[PDB]
């Protein structure tokens, strides 16, 4: 098995991020001990109950089974249990957009949109719901290439259903979630499409803090209140210089009824042809 990384050869470098039940660390897999080894990102749990340990075992199996240019690559595990992934050096898309705004044009955002869409299309085809999709957990491999990451809330669909219900949703951020998620804790590939709409909003505002989803809710008046806005048909406003056709795609992603939202398969070509027509 080349899929097993020895604890002793994973050299801690620094922390990339920390949740409440887990963290990701930049490490060097340095078996030769000369610091020529490759950088990897390593996820582990802290203060984890047995429930979280099982979830993490599933998460590892899910990520491992996904083979897409647009999904963060599984490399292996270390055995206590640690998930080893490729390191994507440019970090999360949210911060990247803020930092490099000036050198990213509409074309580039469409490229990212298209990559994320393909990624989500691929997920759907493995009957996986991501749920957490947002600019803060999409990663940047390069200026020309993003990938979906953070499968901490990802779940495979029941084999007899196209959605699932979660019993306790925790204290996750509400501004990316579809109404059926907010009202009944329902999640599906069609709720993912809603979330993708919010990601398009993020991309095309370059994740400016003053018009973030959370900022725009506060202006436009917690869980009960947002849900009421959405049922009334209120949506995030068109980003300042957003191409009309992108804004329209967002609004479709945010259809009240899950069955009226476009599929990722239908979004893909529409985004790709806006790219051709912009560049
Ligand atoms: C945008 C802030 C944030 O939460 N970024 C973040 C958190 C945790 C991990 C990463 C990161 C950066 N490069 C990586 N490569 C692979 C896996 C995770 C990872 C970024
Ligand atoms: N999808 C969408 O428009 N949601 C929303 C609406 C108002 C405030 C925050 C988020």
Numbering used by the authors: 813 to 891, 897 to 1038, 1046 to 1103
Show sentences the authors wrote.
However, cysteines at the αD-1 position exist also in six other kinases, namely most members of the HER family (EGFR, HER2 and HER4), the Janus kinase JAK3, the SRC kinase BLK and the mitogen activated protein kinase kinase MKK7 (MAP2K7). Our previous study demonstrated the successful use of the tricyclic imidazo [5,4-d]pyrrolo[2,3-b]pyridine scaffold for the design of selective covalent-reversible JAK3 probes FM-381 (5a) and FM-409 (5b) targeting JAK3 C909 via an α-cyano acrylamide warhead. Based on this, we aimed to expand the inhibitor series and explore their potentials as irreversible inhibitors for JAK3 and other kinases that harbor a cysteine at the equivalent position. The determined crystal structures of 9a and 10a in complex with JAK3 confirmed the predicted hinge interaction pattern and covalent modification of C909.
We hypothesized that the 1H-pyrrolo[2,3-b]pyridine (7-azaindole) core in 9a might adopt an inverted binding orientation when compared to 5a,b or common 7H-pyrrolo[2,3-d]pyrimidine derived JAK inhibitors like 4 with two hydrogen bonds between the 7-azaindole and the backbone of L905. As expected, the 7-azaindole core in both compounds was anchored to the hinge region via two hydrogen bonds with the L905 backbone NH and carbonyl oxygen atom, respectively. The warhead amide was present in two flipped conformations and involved in water-mediated hydrogen bonds, most notably with the backbone of C909. The latter interactions may assist in pre-orienting the Michael acceptor to facilitate cysteine addition. To examine whether our replacement strategy of the hinge binding motif for expanding the profile of the JAK3 covalent inhibitors to other kinases succeeded, we characterized the activity of inhibitors 9a and 10a against all kinases featuring the αD-1 cysteine. This screening revealed that the compounds strongly inhibited BMX and TXK with no or less significant binding to other kinases at 200 nM.
